[model samples]
Target: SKTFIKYVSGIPDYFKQSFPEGFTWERTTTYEDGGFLTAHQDTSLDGDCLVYKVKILGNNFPADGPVMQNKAGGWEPSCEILYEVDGVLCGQSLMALKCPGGRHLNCRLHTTYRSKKPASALKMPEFHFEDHRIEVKEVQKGKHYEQYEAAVARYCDAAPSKLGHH
Candidate 1:
């Protein structure tokens, strides 16, 4: 079990530093026993900005519990642990704005004997520029589209060119 103060204090420095400028707190979700989120990507709802997630409770996952990223055609374990106390894991990651096909920053909670007891919660805070603007356009059908297609390939071997764009 972790105290609220310690938990709040553990937010990464990047977020604390960015707060003085102007960042919006998107939403916070809490999970109890067996609570988990499915694989999905953040879009306009998150303002297409950097998201900082904090694990506020529960035991440390066995190095593979916090977050996952699609890489080399598969989902791989990823995240940097920020704080650990009494065996609990508190961590955060800066989500990538773009990813190769089927690749997006995702996470899931594992229900173990230890995790099943106390509740676990993750708070997600996303920051957008003060004058943020979004524009949409149809995909070009010629070399311009081809140029766009090649960009995703540069990032991954078999990623979809429009993976996260939509």
Candidate 2:
């Protein structure tokens, strides 16, 4: 129940105003000095429920910052930006970026969350990375195979760790 309360409390008043339907939150954790997550999209909770954020407890390790995957298959800086914790505004936007593909044609945004740093600060704290910041272009079906493949390729190669998944 703490997890649910954590995110629900953090939701911004504006967001609540916009998405009146409301949302739910779930809790997750990482371990060890080199606890790092790979690039992946947020999961749809219970079928229709979309993952809005990732929460980490204790001191937000990697005090330096986390590594975020970009469309170019590279990392962008993670300073200043941090996930909003506490109330409705919980989770960090610095971890979120718009997909370049989305700017052109009709493309949906896909995100992968990852941390890069070690040596805990005080105690390992809880932090979160929210997803579904925006909708990503749906891959075309059938004949437009080339388009779909190209888009899929971008997402697949976006993260260095996921390169092998390709």
State the displacement of the C-alpha of residue 151, model 2, in Å, after optimal TM-score superposition.
18
lDDT of 2 by residue, 50-139 (tens): 345444344433443332222421223222212333333233223233335542111122222222222221122233322222223434
Tell me the TM-score of each prediction against the true structure. 0.17, 0.17
**C-alpha local distance difference test of each model:** 0.26, 0.28
In candidate 1 the C-alpha lDDT for residue 76 amounts to 39
lDDT of 1 by residue, 60-90 (tens): 2233322232122223333222333343333
Candidate 2: where is the Cα deviation over 4 Å? Answer: 1-81, 84-89, 94-166
Find the 10 residues in a row with the least total lDDT in model 2. Answer: 147-156
lDDT of 1: 0.26
Best by lDDT: 2
